[PDB]
Write a protein that binds this ligand. Structure first.
Ligand SMILES: Nc1ncnc2c1ncn2[C@@H]1O[C@H](COP(=O)(O)OP(=O)(O)CP(=O)(O)O)[C@@H](O)[C@H]1O
Ligand SMILES: CCCCCCCCCCCC[N+](C)(C)CCCS(=O)(=O)O
Ligand SMILES: [Mg+2]
Ligand code: NA
Ligand code: NA
Length: 350
């Protein structure tokens, strides 16, 4: 037999014998993740067992989509699929899906806690922007980028772990909401630079070591946004839905803190002239990403040209050919659970 079972992180992993010494490294709603040694390849890998992929159509749709995209995409800043397998032998018995990835060392939540110097921080941001540019070029707009779904090696190489939801989900997420853009929270729609707000929130957190816009719910989060950035313009509040517009127009008015007051010199390395230069450049980029109105917010392409980021720019990394996805209806079509199950099986069996 080609499989063995091991209990890891309170779940049963039934895996190919090539995968040895499984140890837990993380989990979330979509699966449980282990590090393992691959004996066929001679390297460590990460194995994710999908959690209840056929619990309902959302689970199945998201599993199928993550499988097709992870296979289709080939970019240094997006996690690659090394292998995928199921221990079950038929469509009728099919229950579990295991994804095998390159093994990274940490998620961004851990890295964010470090006193990051400007070389590391700019490099991490540069790589996130490269990954986002690549996803955008294929029509993948993430909308829920956050530190837990970005991973890093100890050499600061960075990969994004997932693709956010289908276009058809719009700005809806039916735990961690702090990185979602105003246009998402308020239901205004979105364009590509929706992901720039999330990069701004992560960058702001790397500086402050505090979540920028925390809170128990969207209501509390919106207060944190307007208290820090200021009440939005007439150009913007205009567009909100009846109950929302009214709530938003009726909140207390705030000038905003200036970016110097939001991210003071006190948070930045102070040694040298190089350090003073880099504090104002970091601030200036933050001031262009953390902009409530997406019409006034910097683009991914322009953020790559920013002096804080552009030092790293290499067109071989930035300007790679976009993924061509076969399924032009991928985000749209709905299926029964049974139908999704078969689509996923075929995908697993290649
Ligand atoms: N290839 C990998 N290398 C190292 N760690 C990984 C990894 N894949 C996942 N992880 C770790 O496992 C944790 C959760 O994994 P994963 O992101 O796939 O769960 P999830 O999709 O169920 C919810 P979320 O994406 O929001 O974290 C990560 O935050 C990270 O710490
Ligand atoms: C402070 C919290 C406020 C929560 C308010 C919820 C907002 C209500 C949703 C309005 C939907 C408007 N359309 C025009 C349908 C948006 C397009 C679809 S999508 O934006 O891409 O999802
Ligand atoms: Mg995920
Ligand atoms: Na990839
Ligand atoms: Na206000």
């Amino acid at each position: 037999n080609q499989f063995y079972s091991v209990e890891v992180g309170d779940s049963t992993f039934t895996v190919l014998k090539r995968y040895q010494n499984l140890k837990p490294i993380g989990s979330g709603a979509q699966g449980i993740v282990c590090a393992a040694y691959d004996a066929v390849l001679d390297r460590n890998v990460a194995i994710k067992k999908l959690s209840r992929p056929f619990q309902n159509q959302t689970h199945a749709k998201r599993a199928y989509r993550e499988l097709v995209l992870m296979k289709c995409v080939n970019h240094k800043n997006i996690i690659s699929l090394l292998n995928v397998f199921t221990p079950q032998k038929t469509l009728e018995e099919f229950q579990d899906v295991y994804l095998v990835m390159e093994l990274m060392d940490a998620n961004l939540c851990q890295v964010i806690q470090m006193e990051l110097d400007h070389e590391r921080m700019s490099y991490l941001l540069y790589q996130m922007l490269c990954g986002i540019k690549h996803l955008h070029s294929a029509g993948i707009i993430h909308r829920d980028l956050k530190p837990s779904n970005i991973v890093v090696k100890s050499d600061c190489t960075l990969k994004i772990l997932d693709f956010g939801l289908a276009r058809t989900a719009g700005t809806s997420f039916m735990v961690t909401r702090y990185y979602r853009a105003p246009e998402v929270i308020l239901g205004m729609g979105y364009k590509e630079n929706v992901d720039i707000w999330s990069v701004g929130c992560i960058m702001g957190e790397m500086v402050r070591h505090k979540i920028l816009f925390p809170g128990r719910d969207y209501i509390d989060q919106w207060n944190k946004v307007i208290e820090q950035l200021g009440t939005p313009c007439p150009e913007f509040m205009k567009k909100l839905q009846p109950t929302v517009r009214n709530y938003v127009e009726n909140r207390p008015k705030y000038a905003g803190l200036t970016f110097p007051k939001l991210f003071p010199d006190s948070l930045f390395p102070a040694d040298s002239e190089h350090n003073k230069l880099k504090a104002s450049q970091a601030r200036d980029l933050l001031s262009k990403m953390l902009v409530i109105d997406p019409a006034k917010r910097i683009s991914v392409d322009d953020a790559l040209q920013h002096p804080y980021i552009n030092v790293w720019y290499d067109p071989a990394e930035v300007e790679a050919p976009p993924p061509q996805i076969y399924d032009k209806q991928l985000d749209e079509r709905e299926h029964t659970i049974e139908e999704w199950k078969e689509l996923i099986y075929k995908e697993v069996m290649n």
